[PDB]
Design a protein around this ligand. Structure first.
Ligand code: MN
Lengths: 109, 109, 109
């Protein structure tokens, strides 16, 4: 999967977490968010198509994706510990990380 | 997971996509198809057990698996865009790619 | 995801397999167990924080995680073949592998 398909996966799974009821649904959705990021970890946004891999603008995209996967992992642990509301609260703070990362590298759509 | 277990996962998830109702179920099943392929990306079919990795018959299996993951990624994006029928139509064309790849490297079962 | 979050994912998915009804639910949960292990394949338990990577105590943790992913893959194939009870029986023997691996490297909690 390319970049902007995994970003829409993240956004949609965040909507599943809000409408969740138990720890299984949120943990499942969170793992899908972790899954999507790893399959698209090596993907490239449409903006940074012709940018060099060693460019400061591209590596700043790589650390932001690594940061995104780091907040996902922390929310996964809270859901794995049976704390549904402590994780859903972390998924809300995660949403502002997915959103900021998305429009910064979106194709202006 | 070995090769023919992930191929049965693909086949079963295609059946889930036909019986889906919303974008969440098809996107989830599609990501499972992408998941299965990556975990079995380095797997080897029972036929090509003793074939050399640089053999033309083996590399042709590798590019076909890469092609399979490429059609999955495209169907994932259509489901991520909320187009359930545009993606289910792509999952049907994907089914003929999973089927052709399966029996070509199946253990004649 | 770190180590003890993926181990709780494994434990919770085993509980989903017991409460499953069809091949889709068990195969899905099993793939989540395979997923969790690959994302945490390079993770480090809290005990082995300061141990060297070439230490016998650390490599013994690596082969045990590889063994864990091997039993998961075999249970995935049984669920992929439509054998729900043959796989749920394998998931029960898998549970004693997840449990033994968990408390051996748990942070004494
Ligand atoms: Mn990987």
């Amino acid at each position: 999967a390319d970049w902007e398909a995994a970003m829409l996966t993240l956004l949609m799974m965040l909507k599943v977490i809000e409408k969740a009821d138990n720890a299984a649904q949120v943990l499942t959705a969170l793992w899908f968010m972790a899954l999507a990021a790893h399959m698209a970890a090596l993907a490239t946004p449409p903006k940074l198509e012709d940018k060099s891999p060693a460019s400061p603008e591209m590596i700043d995209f790589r650390v932001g994706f690594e940061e995104l996967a780091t907040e996902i992992g922390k929310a996964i642990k809270l859901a794995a510990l049976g704390k549904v509301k402590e994780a859903q609260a972390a998924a809300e703070q995660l949403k502002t990380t997915v959103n900021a990362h998305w429009q910064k590298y979106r194709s202006a759509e």
